[PDB]
Design a protein around this ligand. Sequence first.
Ligand SMILES: OC[C@H]1O[C@@H](OC[C@H]2NC[C@H](O)[C@@H](O)[C@@H]2O)[C@H](O)[C@@H](O)[C@@H]1O
Length: 450
Amino acid sequence: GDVAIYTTTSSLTRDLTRDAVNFSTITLNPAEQYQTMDGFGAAITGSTCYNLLLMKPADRHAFLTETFSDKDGFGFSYIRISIGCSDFSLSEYTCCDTKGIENFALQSEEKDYILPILKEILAINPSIKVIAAPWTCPKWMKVKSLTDRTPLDSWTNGQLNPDYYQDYATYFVKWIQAFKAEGIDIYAVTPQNEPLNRGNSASLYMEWEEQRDFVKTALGPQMKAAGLSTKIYAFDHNYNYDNIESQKNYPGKIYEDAAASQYLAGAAYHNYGGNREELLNIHQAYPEKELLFTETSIGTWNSGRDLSKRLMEDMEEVALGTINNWCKGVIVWNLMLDNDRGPNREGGCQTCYGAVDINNSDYKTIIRNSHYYIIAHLSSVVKPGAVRIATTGYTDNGITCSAFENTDGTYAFVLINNNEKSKKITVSDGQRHFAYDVPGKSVTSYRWAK
Ligand SMILES: OC[C@H]1O[C@@H](OC[C@H]2NC[C@H](O)[C@@H](O)[C@@H]2O)[C@H](O)[C@@H](O)[C@@H]1O
């Protein structure tokens, strides 16, 4: 028909099911434009790659096509990877574990896992955006703290030695360049994953003052001098700033220093603490700066495998909730973990599930979890370059939505009906109209031509 539809229900009566209706209230107002959208997706971790590589090649490629193809799938369009290890790598490591930045090289995990998978994904989707972050700097760039500047031989904790700001900037540059030599353009970085976390299996503490100085004196100058167009997003942690008074408004503080801010596209957030309302505060205070949602997880702590508990809440808070608070993109954590929540690392998340889970006896049977749905419901109809546009018509209980216009002149609409009852909706673009009974506890995505 005229309007293409995707539906998933909490109960799995519909499972990204396809429908269509023809033309025959929520009214889209394309003259009222908000942010443009970069993409949506998941993390391609070492553990994700390991699981994918253990599948039969054709099954892996089918899954990757379904996930990442625009024409043959859901068109996931943003992925996140780690610079060096994360807690879903096959070891603790960095790309320069031997002291001296002259020792920089991509390691076995990149050569054997990350690069082969990303090359397969790029074969399917050559315009996919990649954002990266380190979980730790090389251990030898660490100090115990900024007031105790002695070495710290730890994959976790510590702060970046100010004497190594210039060499660590060089680290980022060599990494980006090595990926480029392999055929992969890095679209964006952050300076550190979750810089207020000292825990995990790999970490580095970095306050806003350190990040400001690192960006303005080393990372921003060096990336620009290398001719890289890679964007830099600040922060990359939770809405509450982990309840550390000094660290509140983390990116805002950095934006106030004009020398740092000139290198920053915006700020990145996760939702592991605090309330997504924070995104609105930051946008209002600095409308010139971008916002991107870069990590959330499902796991044993939030019944991650029970879609009846997760679909509605995750679509409301992670997907539509961030996009309606100015975020240009939404990226979840591990695309694929096995049914044992792995492979994982001692001290890292050992309670996490994947956006999908794969069975580790056959490496074939895959179960989609809430994260796969929330993203596919976005990426299936909202393509890169889409601009979020206003809606008018009546505020209804349990109903949330978002509307966009894609650069190909197609409108896209995504709607959550968090009510047991179906609801009859009617949708207008001003010239054309369509109606659809939206099932209870559903997400529905719609796309049609202007
Ligand atoms: O807070 C919920 C749980 O999060 C688990 O961490 C998951 C991911 N979160 C942030 C980090 O950037 C990732 O490396 C990490 O895998 C955490 O392990 C668990 O203790 C929490 O209960």
